[PDB]
Amino acid sequence: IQRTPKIQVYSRHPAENGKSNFLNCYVSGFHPSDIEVDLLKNGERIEKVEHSDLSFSKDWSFYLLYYTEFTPTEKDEYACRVNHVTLSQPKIVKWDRDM
Amino acid sequence: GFHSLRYFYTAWSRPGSGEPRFVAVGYVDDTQFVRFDSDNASPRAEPRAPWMDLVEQQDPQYWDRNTRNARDAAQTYRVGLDNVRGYYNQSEAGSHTIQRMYGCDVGPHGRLLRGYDQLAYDGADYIALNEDLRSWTAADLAAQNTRRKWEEAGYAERDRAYLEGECVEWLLKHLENGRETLLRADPPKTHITHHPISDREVTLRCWALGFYPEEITLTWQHDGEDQTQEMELVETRPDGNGAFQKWAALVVPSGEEQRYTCHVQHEGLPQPLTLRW
Amino acid sequence: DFQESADSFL
């Protein structure tokens, strides 16, 4: 009884180019709890990424918020890579300032 | 008004890759205020809300007592993982998970509305304290082992003394000490954004940002006709600063944007909002 | 407070 994660990538504030924001990758609805999440800037792992403390929902499925400070620009691509036992290949989800 | 104190335990085995791990968090309503992680060198209970980090003058023994309790809990569920895996005769080479959620709902009079204590094994119901706070529901044959053990130790009585007593008293203490955080009802900041797809279609996206508590209703409506089956409604998500975000988007034909309204309900709002592009 | 347990209860 395993569950594949949902993934949202977004910023804490509406993306104002040149201003400091937070990049969030919210992973939810997964089971079991071990999961690998990396934030990417221009295709390479951001090093100083933090995450919330492991919690879960009514249906027992887990959720985590991974986050890092960032300053978005007009060209800097950002993304979140997620692997999990339920995933035969990792999922990558691009950041979109309108989502 | 109403509120809840809730504790969440996750314990899981890591065969080969180390000893079992135990992570516990506590919430008041939608705000996390404490954590404990057994993978620390000397694990202690740690504050995760501003009113904890700065108002333990009320009880200078809080952290000693809660570190001790979480340490004992960590040991219990580490043992529990072996007991439970044996009930199923599962191989020791697989990873397995026990979860527990317990706590209390209080009403506006400050009295218990309901207490609860529920456990899962590998993501499915395993055993739960019944609403009489006196007996247990076991979900399968293995869980009846745990129930008989728990009946013999008289553990429902202890569970329940905690739920009607310390749980209620601590919920009420946290609400007073954390009133600035917990009794806020921050309404969402709302706006619509507009994203052309082609010459003929455009996405309208209605945004709710920065709100607390998490509960909220966002709908799109087409001149009276509700659009719940047409829209994409994203799961509510944490902002990372103690509040939440949500949006609902709708594909409409170009030229028709003015006929659609977004409707936002949240308890921080004096009245529901209606947005129009 | 976290609830206190009683040795091993599972």
Numbering used by the authors:
A (entry chain B): 1 to 99
B (entry chain A): 1 to 277
C (entry chain C): 1 to 10
Task: Give the published text.
Major histocompatibility complex (MHC) class I molecules (MHC I) present antigen peptides to the surface of antigen presenting cells (APCs) to active T cells through interaction with T-cell receptors (TCRs), which play pivotal roles in antiviral defense. In this study, we screened bat MHC I Ptal-N*01:01–binding peptides from different bat-borne viruses (HeV, EBOV, MERS-CoV, and H17N10) and determined the structures of bat MHC class I complexed with these viral peptides. The overall structures of Ptal-N*01:01 display the common characteristics of classical MHC I molecules in other mammals, with the extracellular region of the heavy chain folding into three different domains. The α1 and α2 domains construct a typical PBG that contains two α1-helices and eight β-sheets, and the α3 domain and β2m display typical immunoglobulin (Ig) domains and underpin the peptide binding domain.
To verify the uncommon peptide presentation features of bat MHC I, we determined the crystal structures of Ptal-N*01:01 in complex with the two HeV-derived peptides, HeV1 (DFANTFLP) and HeV2 (DYINTNVLP), two EBOV-derived peptides, EBOV-NP1 (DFQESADSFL) and EBOV-NP2 (DFQESADSFLL), one H17N10-derived peptide, H17N10-NP (DFEKEGYSL), and one MERS-CoV-derived peptide, MERS-CoV-S3 (DFTCSQISP). Although having different lengths, the 8-mer peptide HeV1, 9-mers HeV2 and H17N10-NP, 10-mer EBOV-NP1, and 11-mer EBOV-NP2 in the PBG of Ptal-N*01:01 all display an M-shaped conformation, with P2 and PΩ residues as the primary anchors and the P5 or P6 residue as the secondary middle anchors. The P1 Asp of all of the peptides adopts a rigid conformation upward to the α1-helix of the heavy chain.
